[PDB]
Structures are given as structure tokens and as C-alpha cells.
Design a protein around this motif. Structure first.
Motif, short mmCIF file in Angstrom:
data_model
loop_
_atom_site.label_atom_id
_atom_site.label_comp_id
_atom_site.label_asym_id
_atom_site.label_seq_id
_atom_site.Cartn_x
_atom_site.Cartn_y
_atom_site.Cartn_z
N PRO A 5 0.82 -1.20 0.00
CA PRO A 5 0.00 0.00 0.00
C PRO A 5 0.87 1.26 0.00
O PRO A 5 1.41 1.65 1.03
CB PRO A 5 -0.87 -0.12 1.24
N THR A 6 0.97 1.87 -1.17
CA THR A 6 1.76 3.08 -1.32
C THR A 6 0.85 4.28 -1.62
O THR A 6 -0.19 4.13 -2.26
CB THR A 6 2.81 2.83 -2.40
N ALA A 7 1.28 5.44 -1.14
CA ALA A 7 0.52 6.66 -1.35
C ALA A 7 0.76 7.16 -2.78
O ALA A 7 1.80 7.74 -3.07
CB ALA A 7 0.92 7.69 -0.30
N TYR A 8 -0.23 6.93 -3.62
CA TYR A 8 -0.15 7.35 -5.01
C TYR A 8 -0.59 8.80 -5.17
O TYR A 8 -1.63 9.20 -4.64
CB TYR A 8 -1.12 6.45 -5.79
N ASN A 9 0.22 9.56 -5.90
CA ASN A 9 -0.07 10.96 -6.13
C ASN A 9 -1.51 11.11 -6.61
O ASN A 9 -1.90 10.50 -7.61
CB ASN A 9 0.85 11.55 -7.20
N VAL A 10 -2.27 11.92 -5.89
CA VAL A 10 -3.66 12.15 -6.23
C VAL A 10 -3.81 13.55 -6.82
O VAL A 10 -3.64 14.54 -6.11
CB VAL A 10 -4.55 11.91 -5.01
N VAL A 11 -4.13 13.59 -8.10
CA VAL A 11 -4.30 14.86 -8.79
C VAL A 11 -5.77 15.04 -9.17
O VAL A 11 -6.56 14.09 -9.08
CB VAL A 11 -3.36 14.94 -10.00
N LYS A 12 -6.11 16.25 -9.58
CA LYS A 12 -7.47 16.56 -9.97
C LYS A 12 -7.46 17.53 -11.15
O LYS A 12 -7.44 18.74 -10.96
CB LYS A 12 -8.27 17.07 -8.76
N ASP A 13 -7.46 16.96 -12.34
CA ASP A 13 -7.44 17.75 -13.56
C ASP A 13 -6.00 18.15 -13.88
O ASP A 13 -5.68 18.46 -15.03
CB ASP A 13 -8.26 19.04 -13.38
N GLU A 14 -5.17 18.12 -12.85
CA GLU A 14 -3.77 18.47 -13.02
C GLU A 14 -3.18 18.95 -11.69
O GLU A 14 -1.96 18.94 -11.50
CB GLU A 14 -3.59 19.53 -14.11
N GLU A 15 -4.07 19.36 -10.80
CA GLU A 15 -3.66 19.85 -9.50
C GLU A 15 -3.47 18.68 -8.53
O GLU A 15 -4.29 17.76 -8.50
CB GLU A 15 -4.66 20.86 -8.94
N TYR A 16 -2.39 18.75 -7.76
CA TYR A 16 -2.09 17.70 -6.80
C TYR A 16 -2.95 17.85 -5.54
O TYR A 16 -2.75 18.76 -4.75
CB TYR A 16 -0.62 17.90 -6.42
N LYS A 17 -3.90 16.93 -5.41
CA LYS A 17 -4.80 16.94 -4.26
C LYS A 17 -4.06 16.39 -3.04
O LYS A 17 -4.16 16.94 -1.95
CB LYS A 17 -6.09 16.20 -4.59
N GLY A 18 -3.34 15.30 -3.26
CA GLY A 18 -2.60 14.66 -2.20
C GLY A 18 -2.03 13.31 -2.65
O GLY A 18 -1.31 13.24 -3.64
N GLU A 19 -2.38 12.28 -1.89
CA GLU A 19 -1.92 10.94 -2.20
C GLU A 19 -2.95 9.90 -1.75
O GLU A 19 -3.63 10.10 -0.74
CB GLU A 19 -0.55 10.67 -1.57
N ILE A 20 -3.03 8.82 -2.51
CA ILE A 20 -3.97 7.75 -2.19
C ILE A 20 -3.19 6.46 -1.93
O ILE A 20 -2.45 5.99 -2.79
CB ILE A 20 -5.03 7.62 -3.29
N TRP A 21 -3.39 5.92 -0.73
CA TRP A 21 -2.72 4.69 -0.35
C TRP A 21 -3.53 3.52 -0.89
O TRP A 21 -4.72 3.38 -0.58
CB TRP A 21 -2.52 4.63 1.17
N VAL A 22 -2.87 2.70 -1.70
CA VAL A 22 -3.52 1.54 -2.29
C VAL A 22 -2.47 0.45 -2.54
O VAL A 22 -1.31 0.75 -2.81
CB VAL A 22 -4.27 1.95 -3.56
N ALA A 23 -2.92 -0.79 -2.45
CA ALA A 23 -2.04 -1.93 -2.66
C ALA A 23 -2.54 -2.74 -3.86
O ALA A 23 -3.74 -2.77 -4.13
CB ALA A 23 -1.97 -2.76 -1.38
N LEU A 24 -1.60 -3.37 -4.54
CA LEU A 24 -1.93 -4.17 -5.70
C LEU A 24 -1.29 -5.56 -5.55
O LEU A 24 -0.22 -5.69 -4.97
CB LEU A 24 -1.52 -3.45 -6.99
#
Length: 136
Positions: free
Chosen positions: A107-126
Motif C-alpha cells: 500500500p503506497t501513497a499514489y499521487n492524487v491529482v485533480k485535472d492536473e492539481e495535486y490533491k494529495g496521495e492515495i494509499w492503495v495496494a496491488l
């Protein structure tokens, strides 16, 4: 843009841990945002982060069926109020290339953007599961 190379094939895992925002970002604050995975015309929303804060968790898990073409997972965030097709507080790109090579991604914090703006990060595992030796 050109295709050709071959890819794996089997089951894929998606562990939606949580998502944290920046220090000065009103992302996922006083709301009920939810994550929405997508793997081959196949998406799946998670529990509604009811009053969770700027760090809404889920600790959910979504299994998908990979079959070439798909080499990345799409994660869009919105508001229980809104709809997947309206306004996504943000999004993130979770590639399955690392999971297809490693076979399991934490589970890594994936860069969370919105249209191009960095909202934050999303932790998810694969976690990939190739149809090994079964029929024999």
C-alpha cells in the motif's frame, strides 16, 4: 502511441487503504468522499468515508480480471453526494506494471491529482495472481 508487446493475464488485487492530503489542502474534509476503481470497463466504489476527516480510510479490497490492454488502475474520488460522473475531488493512477513484474505491491501513497492539481496521495495496494499450474 503504438501497441504490440504482450502482457500477463490473471486476477488483480486492489487494497484501498486510505488517502491523505497535503498540509494546506481542503481535500476530503467535512464530507463523505469515496474511491472508485476501474479495470476494463469495470469499476467498484468503496465504503463511504463517513466523517473520517482528511484521512478517510476504507481498508477494502477489489479483485479484477486482467486480460491484456489493462496495465493500470484508475482511482477517482468524489462525494457520496455527487456522482462518479459529476465532479471527482481528485484521482490517481495506479499502474499494474509493477504488480505484473513483482506480482505483489504494498500500500503506497499514489499521487492524487485533480485535472492536473495535486490533491494529495492515495494509499492503495496491488497484487497480481497469474493463472499458474491449475489444469493438469
Amino acid at each position: 502511441g503504438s501497441s504490440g508487446s504482450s502482457g500477463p493475464h490473471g486476477t488483480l488485487e486492489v487494497v484501498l487503504v486510505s488517502a491523505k492530503g497535503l498540509e494546506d489542502a481542503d481535500f476530503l474534509n467535512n464530507m463523505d468522499p469515496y474511491v472508485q476503481l476501474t479495470c476494463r470497463t469495470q469499476d467498484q466504489k468503496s465504503n463511504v468515508a463517513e466523517g473520517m476527516g482528511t484521512t478517510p480510510e476504507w481498508n477494502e479490497t477489489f479483485i479484477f480480471t486482467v486480460s491484456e490492454g489493462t496495465t493500470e488502475l484508475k482511482a477517482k474520488i468524489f462525494d457520496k453526494d455527487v456522482g462518479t460522473e459529476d465532479d471527482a475531488v481528485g484521482e490517481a493512477t495506479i499502474p499494474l506494471e509493477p504488480v505484473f513484474v513483482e506480482g505483489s505491491i504494498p500500500p503506497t501513497a499514489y499521487n492524487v491529482v485533480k485535472d492536473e492539481e495535486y490533491k494529495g496521495e492515495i494509499w492503495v495496494a496491488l497484487s497480481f495472481k497469474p493463472s499458474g499450474p491449475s489444469s493438469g
